Amino acid sequence: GEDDAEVQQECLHKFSTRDYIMESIFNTLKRYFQAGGSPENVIQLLSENYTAVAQTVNLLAEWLIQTGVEPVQVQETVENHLKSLLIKHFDPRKADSIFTEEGETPAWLEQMIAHTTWRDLFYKLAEAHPDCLMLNFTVKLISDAITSVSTACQQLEVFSRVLRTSLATILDGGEENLEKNLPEFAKMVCHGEHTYLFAQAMMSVLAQEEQGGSAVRRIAQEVQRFAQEKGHDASQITLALGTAASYPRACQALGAMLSKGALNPADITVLFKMFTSMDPPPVELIRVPAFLDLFMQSLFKPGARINQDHKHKYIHILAYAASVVETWKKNKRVSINKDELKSTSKAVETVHNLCCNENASELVAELSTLYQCIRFPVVAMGVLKWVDWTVSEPRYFQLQPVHLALLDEISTCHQLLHPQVLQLLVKLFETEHSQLDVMEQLELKKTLLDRMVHLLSRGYVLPVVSYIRKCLEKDTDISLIRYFVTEVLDVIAPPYTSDFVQLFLPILENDSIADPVTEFIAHCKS
Amino acid sequence: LQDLGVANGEDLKETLTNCTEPLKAIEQFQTENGVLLPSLQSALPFLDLHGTPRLEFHQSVFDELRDKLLERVSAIASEGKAEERYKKLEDLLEKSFSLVKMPSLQPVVMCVMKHLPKVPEKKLKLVMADKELYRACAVEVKRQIWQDNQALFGDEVSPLLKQYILEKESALFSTELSVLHNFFSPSPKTRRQGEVVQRLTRMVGKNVKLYDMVLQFLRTLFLRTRNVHYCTLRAELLMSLHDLDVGEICTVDPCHKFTWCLDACIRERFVDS
Secondary structure (H helix, E strand, O other), rough: OOOOHHHHHHHHHHHHHOOOOOOOOOHHHHHHHHHOOOOOHHHHHHHOOOOOHHHHHHHHHHHHHHHHOHHHHHHHHHHHHHHHHHHHOOHHHHHHEEEEEOOOOOOHOOOOHHHHHHHHHHHHHOOOOOOHHHHHHHHHHOOOOOOOOOHOOOOHHHHHHHHHHHHHHHHHHOOOHHHHHHHHHEEEEEHHHHHHHHHHHHHHHHHHOOOHHHHHHHHHHHHHHHHHHHOOHHHHHHHHHHHHHOOHHHHHHHHHHHHOOOHHHHHHHHHHHHHHHHOOOOOOOOHHHHHHHHHHHHOOOOOOOOOHHHHHHHHHHHHHHHHHHEEEEEOOEEEEOOOOHHHHHHHHHHHHHHHOOOOOHHHHHHHHHHHHHHHOOOHHHHHHHHHHHHOOOOOOOOOOOOOOOOHHHHHHHHHHHHHHHHHHHHHHHOOOOOOHHHHHHHHHHHHHHHHHHHHHHHHOOHHHHHHHHHHHHHOOOOOHHHHHHHHHHOOOOOOOOOHHHHHHHHHOOOOOOOOHHHHHHHHOOO | HHOOOOOOHHHHHHHHHHOOHHHHHHHHHHHHHHOOOHHHHHHHHHHHHOOOOOOHHHHHHHHHHHHHHHHHHHHHHHOOOOOOOOOHHHHHHHHHHHHOOOOOHHHHHHHHHHOOOOOHHHHHHHHHHHHHHHHHHOOOOHHHHHHHOOHHHHHHHHHHHHHHHHHHHHHOOOOOOOHHHHHHHOOOHOOOOHHHHHHHHHHHHOOOHHHHHHHHHHHHHHHHHHHHHHHHHHHHHHHHHHOOOOOOOOHOOOOOOHHHHHHHHHOOOOOOO
């Protein structure tokens, strides 16, 4: 039958309801005026319940602006309200319907994208929807202005072009910006094993260049680390890529150890017999970072399971990894130095005995042999992981902290361990205990600040002051930053390069005392 | 709307009446009564497409922004330099009293009149004259009219005094006898808990002129009735002022200490040493 008796009431519900005149009112009005009936009382129903809420808002908003309160507060409030209403009421089906009625969203989308909050709205909408056509198109096009990983790896050509551009940005990032340039690439590579194997093979071929391919090898190892973080075993990848195929025993042994993310006396015994043979396989073959981290957590956490008949075998293989010089005569190991092996293994043995004994005062007893033996780099890493796991226990500072002293030997005597030590203390500078009160927390924080100032004195100055700026802008109270400046200007000698001033002085703007601060600011601005 | 130079519904129908292009006139009225931000004139069609009319986000921001306007009325009462803050509140008063007739800006202006010690009394006169304002007016608005003229004070204390005598007569004539209790068991502070005298204290607040006014009303009715009820209501009003710790009456009234002593006397029903 005729839908007039129902559709006219459907429209009149939206006419005679409180306050609907301002709208789909046109569509329903057309459905009614074509359906006949009483169109004169329709307009009266639209304007009867017109409460004039809009002019009420005019009065109220202009009165808030009369009050001297910032109108940008009103802008933020209205934007937050409407954006939250959108997110609560967003329908992916209707976004795809906007796509269906036309492929490119009309100018309302291109006007919203000018607003940063609406761009973030589209990011949160489309980062979770890898099949909604509107959302996928918006995220991909805004990347052309996150590139969604599903459309990043949907074909070779897109993956390759975004890969090479992102890798160019990583290489441009030097040694700091990779933290932001690598994940967008890495999470793009870490979605499938085929995009994975392709990117790893490309980086392997790129790594053969002696004009910086070492860095591409580094980034490939980092991407493999991330692929492990996504729970995907790239063991056989590194095997068939590297020289594992040159030695099947080392191949199966190492690859099994990497696939588990743990060691074992069996594969370790295989490598021990191989390197005890007259033809030891390449030391590069075992020099893999996660593998050596397995050595660390076997030898320096409490436990693990261990036999004495294999304890020395683990130790000797790690010594061979950390000691032996193989010179390539066109990829030919012809000279094998094993003369700095036995001392390294002896130091590793003694230090691992101490560390797995769960030492404090006994450390100070044999600190002589320790600082004698931290000169070995691998031993320094091992003690670093041991003291990390001891000190990372919740409330390890209420009971002896001598351990923080040992970094002084490490970082001072080993330059490349500056990034680890600071990147250890960034956790320890955020220590918080309800037992050890905020006074003691600030005491430990200031101790760690003195450690970080010393590490700055060794040249690790850009990331120290950058993180100090970040945590002041965040966490770190003004007292801690003032104490930082106190110790710094008490220890650092002029001249002060502008690479250090550019971050140290514009955060020192908060304070003017520790007077040495006045001298520093005057010298560094003049 | 015309009080500050904006149109009303009759002007809208004029804009529609006898027009060859009513639709464009309607659109012009809509433009001339919208919220004037440049992001909205594009977003209004887009949000309209959702099934959400423009008035709906207007309602949300309406609630938000008058909540903040009332917050800032209280703030400017308590914030800013004195001359500037009172100038701001009086100017905002002149802006807002044109819409006290509307259902939005009554209590806002009532707070503004609450926080100013004196006002041009035209608006207080309208507050007493109109029953809606007579209800919703803040307590200091009512105080300022009473402090400027005793008409409304007499007009509202007469029914309240009548109700107090109604309570006295009804309680004195009640037919219950027991070993358990009687009607003289409540102490004077027990009897002050009724909303009659507590509301009378709210009507007086901390003002001494209204204290004299209630004193003279109770005096006249006590001189005509020869009944102790109005005396009891004076005592209850004074000790209700003391229950609020009203220093404006308690410290200056020589009778306050003596009535406070008498309160404990009545509480034990004896005058101990």
